Design a protein around this nucleic acid. Sequence first.
RNA 1: GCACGGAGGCGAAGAACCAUGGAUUUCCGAAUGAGAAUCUCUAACAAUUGCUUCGCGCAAUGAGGAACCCCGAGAACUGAAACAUCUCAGUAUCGGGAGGAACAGAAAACGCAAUGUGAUGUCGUUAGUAACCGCGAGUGAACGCGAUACAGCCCAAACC
RNA 2: AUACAGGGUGACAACCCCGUACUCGAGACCAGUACGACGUGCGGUAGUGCCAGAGUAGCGGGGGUUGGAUAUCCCUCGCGA
RNA 3: GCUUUACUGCAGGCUGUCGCUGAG
Lengths: 65, 56, 194, 46, 81
Amino acid sequence: TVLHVQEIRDMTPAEREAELDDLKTELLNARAVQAAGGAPENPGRIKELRKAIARIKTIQGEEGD
Amino acid sequence: TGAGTPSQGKKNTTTHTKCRRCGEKSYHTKKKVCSSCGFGKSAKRRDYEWQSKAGE
Amino acid sequence: ARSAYSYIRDAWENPGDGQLAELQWQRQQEWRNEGAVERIERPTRLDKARSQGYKAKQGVIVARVSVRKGSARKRRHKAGRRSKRQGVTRITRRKDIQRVAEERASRTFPNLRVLNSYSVGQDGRQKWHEVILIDPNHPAIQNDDDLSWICADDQADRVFRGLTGAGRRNRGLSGKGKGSEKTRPSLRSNGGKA
Amino acid sequence: GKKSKATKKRLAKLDNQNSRVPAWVMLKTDRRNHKRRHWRRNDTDE
Amino acid sequence: SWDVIKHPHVTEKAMNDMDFQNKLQFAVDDRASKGEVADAVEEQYDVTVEQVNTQNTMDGEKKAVVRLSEDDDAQEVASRI
RNA sequence: GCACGGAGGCGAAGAACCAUGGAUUUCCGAAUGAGAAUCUCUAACAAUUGCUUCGCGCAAUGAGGAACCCCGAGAACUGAAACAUCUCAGUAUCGGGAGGAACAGAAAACGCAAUGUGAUGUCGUUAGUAACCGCGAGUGAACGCGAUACAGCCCAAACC
RNA sequence: AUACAGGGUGACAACCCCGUACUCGAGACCAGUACGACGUGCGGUAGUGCCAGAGUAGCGGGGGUUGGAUAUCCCUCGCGA
RNA sequence: GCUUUACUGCAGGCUGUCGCUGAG
Ligand SMILES: [Cl-]
Ligand SMILES: [Cl-]
Ligand SMILES: [K+]
Ligand SMILES: [Mg+2]
Ligand SMILES: [Mg+2]
Ligand SMILES: [Mg+2]
Ligand SMILES: [Mg+2]
Ligand SMILES: [Mg+2]
Ligand SMILES: [Mg+2]
Ligand SMILES: [Mg+2]
Ligand SMILES: [Mg+2]
Ligand SMILES: [Mg+2]
Ligand SMILES: [Mg+2]
Ligand code: NA
Ligand code: NA
Ligand code: NA
Ligand code: NA
Ligand code: NA
Ligand code: NA
Ligand code: NA
Ligand code: NA
Ligand code: NA
Ligand code: NA
Ligand code: NA
Ligand code: NA
Ligand SMILES: [Sr+2]
Ligand SMILES: [Sr+2]
Ligand SMILES: [Sr+2]
Ligand SMILES: [Sr+2]
Ligand SMILES: [Sr+2]
Ligand SMILES: [Sr+2]
Ligand SMILES: [Sr+2]
Ligand SMILES: [Sr+2]
Ligand SMILES: [Sr+2]
Ligand SMILES: [Sr+2]
C-alpha cells in the first residue's frame, strides 16, 4: 500500500537496503508488541510490511541490487 | 509364563521409527531399513505388483 | 588385392591352429589374471571390429569381458513342484553368454551404449568377448554420419532391451519367414512362446 | 527416553495440532477437531 | 536468509529476569548459536551482551536468555519496544 | 481461499480474479563432502564412466511416472471328474530397461509353383483349418486375401 | 428464433440471468511434416576368378520351448565349410 | 505332517568319456 513499486524502483540500491533494514525493524517491533499481547496494533500493516519487504527484495534482484 | 498378557509387559524396545525418506513410521532403527519405502536398502522406491489386485 | 584385414579374419577362422594358436595360449594367461571387464586401447580382431562399426575415433571404446562357461546356475525348488518343474542340472538360460557379456560391459560404462561385440575365444572354464561401446555425448560422434544414429534417446540402454545384433539373433529375429511366427515383432507381443 | 532435536520438533508440532477449532471458525462456518489426540488414550509415531 | 531474532519472549518469568538480573529473553531461530544470538542482540539494540543461555522449546522454537552488561539496563531496553 | 466471525486493511497509483513469462523456493529425499529416524560434523559431481587442457576442467549415468512397451526370471491352486506328460500359463509374481508410444523393418523372404507376390506393424479373414496331444482332456499357427498406413536407405571391403 | 441444448432465478422460463445458433479470435497437436529451393549426381556397354561380415553355415550329445509334426525358436557341451 | 525294498522324479556322491590339454 503506502509503499508502491515505482517509488521502490526510483530508490538507489543503497536506498532499498536502508529502506529494507527500516521495514524489517518496524516489523520486528510489531511482532514484539504482538508477543507482549499489545493491543495498539493495526493488523493491516503487520501484513503490509511483509509484502513491502518481498517487493524490495524482488526489485533488488531485478535491478541487480 | 504365558505368551499373552504377561509377555506383553516386556515390550519397551524401539524398532520402527519415522522414516527420513517417506515419512512413515517404518524405519527400523536397528536395521536402519524402512519396511515401507525401502530406504537404507535400495535407492529405488519399494514397490510390488501384489500391493493391488492383479488386473488393477 | 586382399586387404590386410582379411588376414586377421582368416587367422581367426581357426583360432586353434597356426600362430594364432600360440598367441591365445600366451594371452589367456594374462586374461585369466585380469578383471571381469577390462578396457583395451585396440580391438584384438580389427577386421571384425571395423566390420561391426568400429572406428579409430574419440568416443569409441572397446572392452574385453569374461564370463563363466556352462549352463544355468540355478537354485533347486524350495516349494512343491511337479517332476517337470523340478529340473535343476540340465536347464540352461535363454540368453547366450555373449549377451550376458554385453550387459556387464555396458553396466561398467553407464554413459556408453553397446554397438556390437564379438568372440575372442575361451578356455575350459570361461569365455571372452570384446564389446564396442560408443559415447553418445561426445561431439566427434554426434557428428559422425555412420554412428550419430546411436545418439538418439530411444537408443539409451539399447543392450538391456535386446536391441543389439546378438540381442536380435538370440530373440530368433534372423528369419523373415518360416520360423519367426512367434519372434517378430517381439517375444513378448507373441505371449513369450518363441 | 532421550529425544533428539528433530524428534522434539515433531513432538511439539503434535502438541500444537492438539488444540481446538477456534470459536470464530464456528460462527463463520455457522457450525470438531477430528485429530484430537490424548497422551494416554493414543499413541503418536516413532 | 533467515533472521536470528524472532521476537521478545514476554512472560512473568521473563520480566523477573529483566528486573532482577538484567536479562532479556528472546524467541530466536533454532539454527542460531549462542554467539550469533549475542551479536544480533548487540547490533539490534546497541547494548553489550555478557552471557547467553539457550533452550530448544517444546514449541519447536529456541528460547534465549541474554544477560546484558551492567552498563546497560534491560528494563529500559525492552521498554522501548 | 475452503469458511456466512470479530477487528482491521487493500483497491481509480485500476486491487481482486485469469493467461503467459519471471522472482523467491527451508530440511529430508536418486540425494552426490562425511555421517544421521528430516539432524549434525569438517570444502566436496559421492560412485561408475567418456573426453581430457590429466585439473572434476568439460560431460554422462543414478530416481520418478496410471498403465501401455522391450529384455530377462518364472509358480501353484485348477482342468484332465484320481494323476505323473499335458493343463492352468509363459498367466501371477520377481530382476533389468526405453519412449510418448515401444518393438519390428527393406528378403540368404514367399512357394495361392508362378510368364506370380515384393520391408514392417496392426485390423478383418484365412480357422478352431494345418500341426500338436496318456492321439485323452485340451493346445493351435502360417502363406494368401480385404483393409489401415506406406519409404526407403547407411556401413565393412575392393580402388584411393 | 441460423438461438425450442443445458443451468440459474422464492413453483412447469426460448423471450428475467448465464448460456445456446451464427460469426470471429488465440493456443496446442498435425509438423520442422508436406510443398519449395541448395548442393550431390541417376543409368548403360565391354573386359577383369579385384571386393562382398566364421567358431559363422552346417553336423552331433544334453536341455528348454513351440502348432512346428523327420519339417519351430533358443540355450548349452563338442565338432566345423 | 510322517514312513518305506509303493509309483514317478529331483538334488547329491562314485565312475567312464569329451573339452580345458602341451612335448617326447
Ligand atoms: Cl547399451
Ligand atoms: Cl504371393
Ligand atoms: K500341475
Ligand atoms: Mg560415406
Ligand atoms: Mg507390437
Ligand atoms: Mg498447552
Ligand atoms: Mg543446553
Ligand atoms: Mg548428506
Ligand atoms: Mg484333476
Ligand atoms: Mg508347456
Ligand atoms: Mg483320463
Ligand atoms: Mg499354449
Ligand atoms: Mg507360410
Ligand atoms: Na551403459
Ligand atoms: Na501414549
Ligand atoms: Na513464536
Ligand atoms: Na515455486
Ligand atoms: Na553428474
Ligand atoms: Na577430472
Ligand atoms: Na477332478
Ligand atoms: Na487328488
Ligand atoms: Na500330452
Ligand atoms: Na487370390
Ligand atoms: Na519355442
Ligand atoms: Na545343440
Ligand atoms: Sr519353562
Ligand atoms: Sr504372570
Ligand atoms: Sr524389554
Ligand atoms: Sr543396505
Ligand atoms: Sr517394484
Ligand atoms: Sr538408464
Ligand atoms: Sr495403556
Ligand atoms: Sr507452549
Ligand atoms: Sr509399400
Ligand atoms: Sr554380405
